[model samples]
Target: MVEKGKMVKISYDGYVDGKLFDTTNEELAKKEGIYNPAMIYGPVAIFAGEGQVLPGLDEAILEMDVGEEREVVLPPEKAFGKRDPSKIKLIPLSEFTKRGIKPIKGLTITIDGIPGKIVSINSGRVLVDFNHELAGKEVKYRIKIEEVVD
Candidate 1:
Protein backbone atom coordinates (compact mmCIF):
# COMPACT_ATOMS: atom_id res chain seq x y z
CA MET A 1 0.00 0.00 0.00
CA VAL A 2 1.09 3.54 -0.70
CA GLU A 3 1.85 5.61 2.33
CA LYS A 4 1.56 9.35 2.49
CA GLY A 5 4.32 11.16 0.56
CA LYS A 6 5.46 8.11 -1.39
CA MET A 7 5.97 8.17 -5.14
CA VAL A 8 4.49 5.60 -7.49
CA LYS A 9 3.98 4.71 -11.11
CA ILE A 10 0.43 3.94 -12.05
CA SER A 11 -1.60 3.16 -15.12
CA TYR A 12 -5.31 3.72 -14.92
CA ASP A 13 -8.40 3.81 -17.06
CA GLY A 14 -11.48 5.70 -15.98
CA TYR A 15 -14.95 5.07 -17.32
CA VAL A 16 -18.53 6.04 -16.96
CA ASP A 17 -21.34 3.71 -17.95
CA GLY A 18 -18.76 1.61 -19.83
CA LYS A 19 -17.63 4.63 -21.85
CA LEU A 20 -13.92 5.34 -21.65
CA PHE A 21 -13.59 8.71 -19.98
CA ASP A 22 -9.90 8.99 -19.17
CA THR A 23 -6.69 7.02 -19.07
CA THR A 24 -3.09 7.32 -18.02
CA ASN A 25 -1.14 6.13 -21.01
CA GLU A 26 0.84 8.50 -23.19
CA GLU A 27 0.10 6.72 -26.43
CA LEU A 28 -3.59 6.53 -25.69
CA ALA A 29 -3.74 10.06 -24.36
CA LYS A 30 -1.91 11.36 -27.41
CA LYS A 31 -4.50 9.74 -29.62
CA GLU A 32 -7.06 11.70 -27.62
CA GLY A 33 -4.87 14.83 -27.76
CA ILE A 34 -4.24 14.94 -24.02
CA TYR A 35 -0.91 16.72 -23.88
CA ASN A 36 -0.29 16.53 -20.16
CA PRO A 37 1.91 13.50 -19.99
CA ALA A 38 2.15 14.00 -16.25
CA MET A 39 -1.46 12.94 -16.14
CA ILE A 40 -0.33 9.65 -17.62
CA TYR A 41 3.32 8.93 -16.93
CA GLY A 42 4.95 7.75 -13.77
CA PRO A 43 6.62 8.39 -11.52
CA VAL A 44 3.27 10.08 -11.94
CA ALA A 45 3.67 10.87 -8.34
CA ILE A 46 1.12 12.41 -6.04
CA PHE A 47 1.37 13.12 -2.33
CA ALA A 48 -1.35 11.78 -0.14
CA GLY A 49 -3.05 14.37 2.10
CA GLU A 50 -1.47 17.05 -0.05
CA GLY A 51 -4.48 17.70 -2.24
CA GLN A 52 -2.36 16.88 -5.28
CA VAL A 53 -5.08 14.65 -6.64
CA LEU A 54 -8.76 14.09 -6.07
CA PRO A 55 -9.75 12.95 -2.57
CA GLY A 56 -11.23 9.67 -3.66
CA LEU A 57 -8.28 8.78 -5.85
CA ASP A 58 -5.89 9.65 -3.08
CA GLU A 59 -7.76 7.39 -0.73
CA ALA A 60 -7.95 4.61 -3.28
CA ILE A 61 -4.20 4.60 -3.86
CA LEU A 62 -3.48 4.21 -0.19
CA GLU A 63 -5.49 1.01 -0.11
CA MET A 64 -3.70 -0.80 -2.90
CA ASP A 65 -0.43 -2.74 -3.03
CA VAL A 66 2.28 -2.65 -5.60
CA GLY A 67 1.21 -4.76 -8.56
CA GLU A 68 -2.34 -4.81 -7.27
CA GLU A 69 -5.27 -3.42 -9.22
CA ARG A 70 -8.74 -2.41 -8.25
CA GLU A 71 -11.92 -0.84 -9.44
CA VAL A 72 -13.54 1.87 -7.43
CA VAL A 73 -16.69 3.90 -7.92
CA LEU A 74 -16.41 7.42 -6.63
CA PRO A 75 -19.52 9.34 -5.82
CA PRO A 76 -19.74 12.94 -6.89
CA GLU A 77 -18.99 14.40 -3.47
CA LYS A 78 -15.87 12.31 -3.13
CA ALA A 79 -14.67 12.75 -6.68
CA PHE A 80 -14.94 16.25 -8.11
CA GLY A 81 -17.76 17.37 -5.94
CA LYS A 82 -21.27 18.03 -7.21
CA ARG A 83 -21.70 20.23 -10.22
CA ASP A 84 -22.65 23.80 -9.64
CA PRO A 85 -25.57 25.06 -11.70
CA SER A 86 -24.25 28.58 -11.46
CA LYS A 87 -21.36 27.57 -13.67
CA ILE A 88 -23.75 27.56 -16.59
CA LYS A 89 -23.73 31.05 -18.03
CA LEU A 90 -25.12 32.78 -21.04
CA ILE A 91 -22.66 34.22 -23.51
CA PRO A 92 -23.51 35.94 -26.74
CA LEU A 93 -23.68 33.43 -29.57
CA SER A 94 -21.88 35.95 -31.72
CA GLU A 95 -18.80 35.42 -29.62
CA PHE A 96 -18.60 31.89 -30.91
CA THR A 97 -18.19 32.91 -34.55
CA LYS A 98 -16.04 35.88 -33.59
CA ARG A 99 -13.62 33.38 -32.10
CA GLY A 100 -13.99 31.18 -35.16
CA ILE A 101 -15.61 28.57 -32.97
CA LYS A 102 -18.70 26.51 -33.43
CA PRO A 103 -21.32 26.16 -30.75
CA ILE A 104 -22.47 22.59 -30.61
CA LYS A 105 -23.72 20.46 -27.77
CA GLY A 106 -21.19 17.92 -26.44
CA LEU A 107 -18.39 19.58 -28.37
CA THR A 108 -15.44 20.33 -26.12
CA ILE A 109 -13.40 23.30 -27.22
CA THR A 110 -10.90 25.43 -25.50
CA ILE A 111 -11.21 29.12 -24.92
CA ASP A 112 -7.64 30.04 -25.78
CA GLY A 113 -7.06 26.27 -25.43
CA ILE A 114 -8.31 26.05 -21.88
CA PRO A 115 -10.75 23.17 -22.07
CA GLY A 116 -14.45 23.94 -21.87
CA LYS A 117 -17.64 22.38 -23.11
CA ILE A 118 -20.69 23.55 -24.99
CA VAL A 119 -23.56 22.64 -22.73
CA SER A 120 -26.45 24.29 -24.49
CA ILE A 121 -27.56 27.11 -26.76
CA ASN A 122 -30.28 29.66 -26.33
CA SER A 123 -31.72 32.61 -28.18
CA GLY A 124 -28.81 34.83 -29.12
CA ARG A 125 -26.81 33.38 -26.26
CA VAL A 126 -24.76 30.23 -25.90
CA LEU A 127 -24.47 28.42 -22.64
CA VAL A 128 -20.82 27.51 -22.34
CA ASP A 129 -20.34 25.67 -19.13
CA PHE A 130 -16.84 25.59 -17.73
CA ASN A 131 -17.26 22.60 -15.49
CA HIS A 132 -15.96 19.08 -15.65
CA GLU A 133 -18.79 17.25 -17.42
CA LEU A 134 -18.29 14.35 -15.04
CA ALA A 135 -18.55 16.50 -11.96
CA GLY A 136 -21.87 15.12 -10.88
CA LYS A 137 -21.65 11.66 -12.33
CA GLU A 138 -20.58 8.56 -10.46
CA VAL A 139 -17.20 7.65 -11.90
CA LYS A 140 -15.71 4.19 -12.22
CA TYR A 141 -11.97 4.03 -11.85
CA ARG A 142 -10.05 1.06 -13.17
CA ILE A 143 -6.50 1.28 -11.94
CA LYS A 144 -3.43 -0.92 -12.21
CA ILE A 145 -0.83 -0.62 -9.50
CA GLU A 146 2.51 -0.66 -11.23
CA GLU A 147 4.79 0.12 -8.28
CA VAL A 148 5.05 1.97 -4.99
CA VAL A 149 8.32 3.50 -3.90
CA ASP A 150 8.67 4.80 -0.40
Candidate 2:
Protein backbone atom coordinates (compact mmCIF):
# COMPACT_ATOMS: atom_id res chain seq x y z
CA MET A 1 0.00 0.00 0.00
CA VAL A 2 1.27 3.51 -0.80
CA GLU A 3 1.51 5.97 2.07
CA LYS A 4 2.73 9.41 2.97
CA GLY A 5 6.53 9.85 3.14
CA LYS A 6 7.06 7.24 0.44
CA MET A 7 8.80 8.17 -2.80
CA VAL A 8 6.98 6.86 -5.81
CA LYS A 9 7.54 7.05 -9.53
CA ILE A 10 4.30 7.21 -11.45
CA SER A 11 3.39 7.68 -15.09
CA TYR A 12 0.18 9.65 -15.46
CA ASP A 13 -2.01 11.18 -18.13
CA GLY A 14 -4.27 14.07 -17.18
CA TYR A 15 -7.35 15.05 -19.10
CA VAL A 16 -10.25 17.44 -18.88
CA ASP A 17 -13.60 16.53 -20.40
CA GLY A 18 -11.77 13.99 -22.55
CA LYS A 19 -9.22 16.53 -23.77
CA LEU A 20 -5.71 15.56 -22.73
CA PHE A 21 -4.16 18.08 -20.36
CA ASP A 22 -0.80 16.71 -19.23
CA THR A 23 1.30 13.58 -19.13
CA THR A 24 4.53 12.27 -17.61
CA ASN A 25 6.25 10.64 -20.53
CA GLU A 26 8.87 12.54 -22.51
CA GLU A 27 7.16 12.05 -25.85
CA LEU A 28 3.97 13.59 -24.54
CA ALA A 29 5.97 16.25 -22.73
CA LYS A 30 7.70 17.18 -25.97
CA LYS A 31 4.39 17.28 -27.80
CA GLU A 32 2.93 19.47 -25.07
CA GLY A 33 6.08 21.64 -24.78
CA ILE A 34 6.55 20.71 -21.17
CA TYR A 35 10.13 21.55 -20.27
CA ASN A 36 10.01 20.34 -16.71
CA PRO A 37 9.06 16.83 -15.67
CA ALA A 38 10.46 17.50 -12.24
CA MET A 39 7.31 19.38 -11.30
CA ILE A 40 5.44 16.09 -11.08
CA TYR A 41 8.22 14.12 -9.47
CA GLY A 42 9.86 16.14 -6.71
CA PRO A 43 6.90 17.72 -4.98
CA VAL A 44 4.99 14.44 -5.08
CA ALA A 45 7.85 12.83 -3.23
CA ILE A 46 8.35 15.44 -0.55
CA PHE A 47 4.92 16.73 0.31
CA ALA A 48 2.15 14.24 -0.18
CA GLY A 49 0.14 15.82 2.64
CA GLU A 50 0.69 19.48 1.91
CA GLY A 51 -1.73 19.53 -1.01
CA GLN A 52 1.34 19.23 -3.19
CA VAL A 53 -0.69 17.22 -5.64
CA LEU A 54 -4.36 17.77 -6.41
CA PRO A 55 -6.62 16.52 -3.62
CA GLY A 56 -8.22 13.75 -5.66
CA LEU A 57 -4.87 12.71 -7.07
CA ASP A 58 -3.19 12.76 -3.68
CA GLU A 59 -5.96 10.72 -2.17
CA ALA A 60 -6.07 8.27 -5.06
CA ILE A 61 -2.34 7.55 -4.95
CA LEU A 62 -2.66 6.36 -1.40
CA GLU A 63 -4.81 3.51 -2.63
CA MET A 64 -2.41 2.35 -5.33
CA ASP A 65 0.11 -0.45 -5.13
CA VAL A 66 3.50 -0.52 -6.71
CA GLY A 67 3.22 -1.47 -10.39
CA GLU A 68 -0.49 -0.86 -10.23
CA GLU A 69 -2.35 1.41 -12.57
CA ARG A 70 -5.68 3.15 -12.18
CA GLU A 71 -7.81 5.96 -13.51
CA VAL A 72 -9.47 8.65 -11.42
CA VAL A 73 -11.67 11.68 -11.92
CA LEU A 74 -11.15 14.90 -9.99
CA PRO A 75 -13.74 17.64 -9.73
CA PRO A 76 -12.74 21.27 -10.10
CA GLU A 77 -12.28 22.09 -6.43
CA LYS A 78 -10.01 19.10 -5.89
CA ALA A 79 -7.84 19.66 -8.93
CA PHE A 80 -6.78 23.28 -9.34
CA GLY A 81 -9.71 24.70 -7.44
CA LYS A 82 -12.39 26.83 -9.14
CA ARG A 83 -10.97 29.38 -11.49
CA ASP A 84 -10.63 32.76 -9.84
CA PRO A 85 -11.92 35.67 -11.86
CA SER A 86 -9.69 37.93 -9.79
CA LYS A 87 -6.62 36.27 -11.27
CA ILE A 88 -7.21 37.78 -14.66
CA LYS A 89 -5.41 41.04 -15.28
CA LEU A 90 -4.46 43.21 -18.23
CA ILE A 91 -0.86 44.23 -18.77
CA PRO A 92 0.59 46.47 -21.44
CA LEU A 93 1.80 44.48 -24.44
CA SER A 94 4.76 46.82 -24.62
CA GLU A 95 5.91 45.32 -21.34
CA PHE A 96 6.14 41.96 -23.06
CA THR A 97 7.84 43.33 -26.16
CA LYS A 98 10.34 45.27 -24.04
CA ARG A 99 11.31 41.97 -22.44
CA GLY A 100 11.45 40.22 -25.83
CA ILE A 101 8.31 38.31 -24.92
CA LYS A 102 5.85 37.45 -27.64
CA PRO A 103 2.20 37.17 -26.64
CA ILE A 104 0.48 34.38 -28.50
CA LYS A 105 -2.73 32.69 -27.46
CA GLY A 106 -2.42 28.92 -26.69
CA LEU A 107 1.34 29.30 -26.50
CA THR A 108 2.84 29.35 -23.03
CA ILE A 109 5.73 31.79 -23.02
CA THR A 110 7.64 32.83 -20.01
CA ILE A 111 7.98 36.48 -19.18
CA ASP A 112 11.78 36.66 -19.12
CA GLY A 113 11.46 32.94 -19.92
CA ILE A 114 9.65 32.19 -16.65
CA PRO A 115 7.01 29.48 -17.09
CA GLY A 116 3.44 30.80 -17.62
CA LYS A 117 0.67 30.90 -20.19
CA ILE A 118 -0.65 33.58 -22.53
CA VAL A 119 -4.36 33.63 -21.65
CA SER A 120 -5.84 36.41 -23.77
CA ILE A 121 -5.12 39.53 -25.74
CA ASN A 122 -6.72 42.90 -26.46
CA SER A 123 -5.59 46.20 -27.99
CA GLY A 124 -2.30 47.35 -26.44
CA ARG A 125 -2.78 45.24 -23.33
CA VAL A 126 -2.39 41.47 -23.15
CA LEU A 127 -4.29 39.56 -20.51
CA VAL A 128 -1.92 37.37 -18.56
CA ASP A 129 -3.75 35.20 -16.11
CA PHE A 130 -1.18 33.32 -13.97
CA ASN A 131 -3.63 30.76 -12.74
CA HIS A 132 -3.45 27.22 -14.07
CA GLU A 133 -5.52 27.22 -17.25
CA LEU A 134 -7.20 23.96 -16.28
CA ALA A 135 -8.61 25.48 -13.13
CA GLY A 136 -12.35 24.98 -12.58
CA LYS A 137 -12.55 21.93 -14.83
CA GLU A 138 -13.13 18.34 -13.88
CA VAL A 139 -10.00 16.36 -14.69
CA LYS A 140 -9.36 12.68 -15.32
CA TYR A 141 -6.16 11.03 -14.23
CA ARG A 142 -4.90 7.77 -15.71
CA ILE A 143 -1.91 6.70 -13.68
CA LYS A 144 0.57 3.84 -13.80
CA ILE A 145 2.29 3.33 -10.49
CA GLU A 146 5.87 2.21 -11.03
CA GLU A 147 7.49 1.88 -7.66
CA VAL A 148 7.34 3.10 -4.09
CA VAL A 149 10.72 3.91 -2.64
CA ASP A 150 11.20 5.09 0.89
Candidate 3:
Protein backbone atom coordinates (compact mmCIF):
# COMPACT_ATOMS: atom_id res chain seq x y z
CA MET A 1 0.00 0.00 0.00
CA VAL A 2 1.16 3.52 -0.68
CA GLU A 3 2.06 5.42 2.47
CA LYS A 4 1.87 9.08 3.44
CA GLY A 5 4.70 11.34 2.29
CA LYS A 6 5.94 8.81 -0.26
CA MET A 7 6.58 10.51 -3.60
CA VAL A 8 4.78 8.81 -6.44
CA LYS A 9 4.06 9.68 -10.04
CA ILE A 10 0.50 9.62 -11.33
CA SER A 11 -1.47 10.43 -14.44
CA TYR A 12 -5.10 11.39 -14.09
CA ASP A 13 -8.04 12.68 -16.06
CA GLY A 14 -10.58 14.77 -14.22
CA TYR A 15 -14.19 15.34 -15.21
CA VAL A 16 -16.94 17.56 -13.91
CA ASP A 17 -20.54 16.85 -14.87
CA GLY A 18 -19.22 14.23 -17.28
CA LYS A 19 -17.09 16.73 -19.20
CA LEU A 20 -13.30 16.49 -19.09
CA PHE A 21 -11.87 19.45 -17.19
CA ASP A 22 -8.27 18.46 -16.62
CA THR A 23 -5.91 15.69 -17.59
CA THR A 24 -2.27 14.75 -17.53
CA ASN A 25 -2.52 13.05 -20.90
CA GLU A 26 -1.74 15.53 -23.64
CA GLU A 27 -3.16 13.40 -26.41
CA LEU A 28 -6.44 12.89 -24.59
CA ALA A 29 -6.65 16.57 -23.84
CA LYS A 30 -6.19 17.42 -27.48
CA LYS A 31 -8.73 14.86 -28.49
CA GLU A 32 -11.23 16.45 -26.13
CA GLY A 33 -10.40 19.98 -27.33
CA ILE A 34 -9.43 21.00 -23.82
CA TYR A 35 -5.68 21.22 -24.34
CA ASN A 36 -3.93 24.18 -22.80
CA PRO A 37 -0.70 25.14 -24.51
CA ALA A 38 0.84 26.34 -21.27
CA MET A 39 0.19 23.07 -19.42
CA ILE A 40 2.88 20.42 -19.19
CA TYR A 41 1.40 16.99 -19.82
CA GLY A 42 2.70 13.77 -18.22
CA PRO A 43 2.63 11.92 -14.98
CA VAL A 44 2.63 14.23 -11.96
CA ALA A 45 4.65 13.39 -8.87
CA ILE A 46 3.06 14.02 -5.52
CA PHE A 47 3.54 13.03 -1.91
CA ALA A 48 0.94 10.48 -0.97
CA GLY A 49 -1.75 11.73 1.44
CA GLU A 50 -0.72 15.27 0.69
CA GLY A 51 -3.26 17.97 -0.29
CA GLN A 52 -1.69 18.34 -3.70
CA VAL A 53 -4.76 16.69 -5.10
CA LEU A 54 -8.36 16.70 -3.92
CA PRO A 55 -9.22 14.87 -0.70
CA GLY A 56 -11.01 12.10 -2.56
CA LEU A 57 -8.14 11.78 -5.02
CA ASP A 58 -5.64 11.52 -2.20
CA GLU A 59 -7.73 8.79 -0.66
CA ALA A 60 -7.67 6.84 -3.89
CA ILE A 61 -3.92 7.30 -4.23
CA LEU A 62 -3.27 5.85 -0.81
CA GLU A 63 -5.11 2.71 -1.84
CA MET A 64 -3.27 2.32 -5.14
CA ASP A 65 -0.12 0.46 -6.06
CA VAL A 66 2.30 1.21 -8.82
CA GLY A 67 0.78 0.46 -12.23
CA GLU A 68 -2.68 0.37 -10.73
CA GLU A 69 -5.55 2.23 -12.36
CA ARG A 70 -8.79 3.30 -10.73
CA GLU A 71 -11.92 5.32 -11.32
CA VAL A 72 -13.43 7.44 -8.58
CA VAL A 73 -16.48 9.63 -8.21
CA LEU A 74 -16.35 12.39 -5.63
CA PRO A 75 -19.12 14.46 -4.15
CA PRO A 76 -18.81 18.21 -3.75
CA GLU A 77 -17.74 17.94 -0.13
CA LYS A 78 -14.89 15.64 -1.04
CA ALA A 79 -13.89 17.64 -4.04
CA PHE A 80 -14.33 21.41 -4.36
CA GLY A 81 -16.77 21.72 -1.48
CA LYS A 82 -20.29 23.15 -1.69
CA ARG A 83 -20.85 26.74 -2.67
CA ASP A 84 -21.72 29.37 -0.08
CA PRO A 85 -24.34 31.92 -0.98
CA SER A 86 -22.47 34.47 1.07
CA LYS A 87 -19.73 34.38 -1.53
CA ILE A 88 -21.95 36.12 -4.02
CA LYS A 89 -21.52 39.88 -3.93
CA LEU A 90 -23.07 42.90 -5.53
CA ILE A 91 -20.73 45.79 -6.12
CA PRO A 92 -21.24 49.15 -7.72
CA LEU A 93 -20.38 49.02 -11.39
CA SER A 94 -18.54 52.27 -10.89
CA GLU A 95 -15.98 50.37 -8.85
CA PHE A 96 -14.96 48.43 -11.90
CA THR A 97 -15.08 51.41 -14.20
CA LYS A 98 -12.88 53.35 -11.82
CA ARG A 99 -10.35 50.55 -12.02
CA GLY A 100 -10.44 50.69 -15.82
CA ILE A 101 -12.14 47.31 -16.01
CA LYS A 102 -15.27 46.90 -18.02
CA PRO A 103 -17.84 44.82 -16.26
CA ILE A 104 -18.74 42.00 -18.57
CA LYS A 105 -20.81 39.00 -17.71
CA GLY A 106 -18.75 35.84 -17.25
CA LEU A 107 -15.52 37.82 -17.06
CA THR A 108 -13.12 36.56 -14.42
CA ILE A 109 -11.57 39.24 -12.29
CA THR A 110 -9.15 39.24 -9.44
CA ILE A 111 -9.14 41.89 -6.78
CA ASP A 112 -6.53 41.91 -4.01
CA GLY A 113 -5.73 38.34 -5.03
CA ILE A 114 -9.35 37.22 -4.60
CA PRO A 115 -10.72 35.89 -7.85
CA GLY A 116 -14.34 35.95 -8.92
CA LYS A 117 -16.44 35.91 -12.02
CA ILE A 118 -19.02 38.47 -13.06
CA VAL A 119 -22.39 36.80 -12.93
CA SER A 120 -24.39 39.77 -14.18
CA ILE A 121 -24.25 43.50 -14.67
CA ASN A 122 -27.19 45.72 -13.92
CA SER A 123 -27.53 49.45 -14.39
CA GLY A 124 -25.18 50.29 -11.52
CA ARG A 125 -24.52 47.08 -9.65
CA VAL A 126 -22.37 44.18 -10.77
CA LEU A 127 -22.94 40.74 -9.39
CA VAL A 128 -19.91 38.58 -8.86
CA ASP A 129 -19.62 35.04 -7.62
CA PHE A 130 -16.51 34.33 -5.61
CA ASN A 131 -17.27 30.69 -5.10
CA HIS A 132 -15.26 28.17 -7.09
CA GLU A 133 -16.75 27.51 -10.50
CA LEU A 134 -17.03 23.82 -9.69
CA ALA A 135 -18.38 24.31 -6.22
CA GLY A 136 -21.35 22.01 -5.44
CA LYS A 137 -20.53 19.84 -8.42
CA GLU A 138 -19.49 16.21 -8.48
CA VAL A 139 -16.16 15.31 -9.95
CA LYS A 140 -14.88 12.11 -11.52
CA TYR A 141 -11.35 10.92 -12.00
CA ARG A 142 -9.56 8.28 -13.95
CA ILE A 143 -6.30 7.67 -12.12
CA LYS A 144 -3.20 5.68 -12.96
CA ILE A 145 -0.28 5.25 -10.63
CA GLU A 146 2.75 5.17 -12.86
CA GLU A 147 5.66 4.80 -10.42
CA VAL A 148 6.80 5.18 -6.85
CA VAL A 149 9.85 7.34 -6.47
CA ASP A 150 12.95 5.70 -4.98
| Number of the predicted model whose TM-score against the real structure is largest | 3
lDDT of 3 by residue, 1-150 (tens): 799999999999999878999999999999999999999999999999999999999999999988999999999988998887899999999999899999899999997899999999988999999998899899999999999997
The top-ranked prediction according to lDDT is: 3
The whole-model lDDT of each prediction reads: 0.74, 0.73, 0.94
Worst 10 residues of 1 by lDDT: 40-49
Estimated TM-score for each candidate: 0.70, 0.62, 0.92
Q: After superposition, how far is residue 55 of candidate 2 from its true place, in Å?
A: 3.1
Clashes of each: 0, 0, 0
The order of the candidates by lDDT, greatest first, is 3, 1, 2
Segments of candidate 1 deviating more than 4 angstroms: 25-43, 97-102
Weakest ten-residue segment in model 2 by summed lDDT: 41-50
Better of 2 and 3 by TM-score: 3
